Design a protein around this ligand. Sequence first.
Ligand SMILES: [Zn+2]
Lengths: 193, 158
Amino acid sequence: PAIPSNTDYPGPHSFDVSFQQSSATWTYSTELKKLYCQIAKTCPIQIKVMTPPPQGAVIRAMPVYKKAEHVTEVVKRCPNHELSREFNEGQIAPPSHLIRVEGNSHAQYVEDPITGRQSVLVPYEPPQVGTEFTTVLYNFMCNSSCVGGMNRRPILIIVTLETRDGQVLGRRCFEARICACPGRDRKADEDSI
Amino acid sequence: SDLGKKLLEAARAGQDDEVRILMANGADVNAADHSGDTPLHLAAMEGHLEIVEVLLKTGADVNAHDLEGYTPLHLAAYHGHLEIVEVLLKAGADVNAWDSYGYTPLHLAAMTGHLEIVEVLLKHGADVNAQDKFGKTPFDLAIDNGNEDIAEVLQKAA
Ligand SMILES: [Zn+2]
């Protein structure tokens, strides 16, 4: 359909998305399926499969508004951040895209001519060897609070495993909060209980 | 706005020289971005101590609140920047300022496990009895997040 689906779909390759703190200012609540992170900072995401995707498969990340009232509206950066020098010197990423990939010169930035949806794709790569997971580094390029952009409206990040021709093989979704103190926002969500 | 925006960017980025030249060229030290963050907020959050000192000595408002109700001290405490917490306190930061959820800096240091920051906040009169929006003291946030060294310290100060 035109509105992107946000329902987990493991599909035939048992596609899953997980988070792991290593030895960074992000926190992920496995309970609320919610990422708390800072603007422009590295958020590593781990992709699991059980069988190898086909030749030319990709991983797409697309932001969508969570609330029914907002879901038709394309998530993108606020004019302040789109037009600033800050974070925008020497990027493949168009400066309006909320989601960037860090550390992969094969990132493709897509904007649908009809829906206006913006997303970022990488070619699917199997994990290193002996490693369980394919790691994708994301950066989120506006605060949730950005006036003229998300304007405090909650978003989902929709991660899809797809064939080269855009057939969806797998889908996982999590909420993203981009804020100054991720643990503080996390604690306030948890304590609202 | 030109220079204000440039100062906000240099302050977040830790560009010491650019901050210094921008102040020299008349940049507004209390320029605020659309989140209501001042250069002092951004430098305190990102741990840029020299920039913090330059901003305070050129008239930065030490107790400016952004749109979340954070002061620079909230950001320095959460993000674990002890030297900055000390400089902010010595520049008259409000030790018991509360954000939009009633979190104090001692709440944020307790929550994140920053023992040394807890100790300096207490020395400057941090309120162990302060309660957030959810009735929690810094001791309770310490217990919830499994910070036991901090919990013991906050008890002995109660
Ligand atoms: Zn923005």
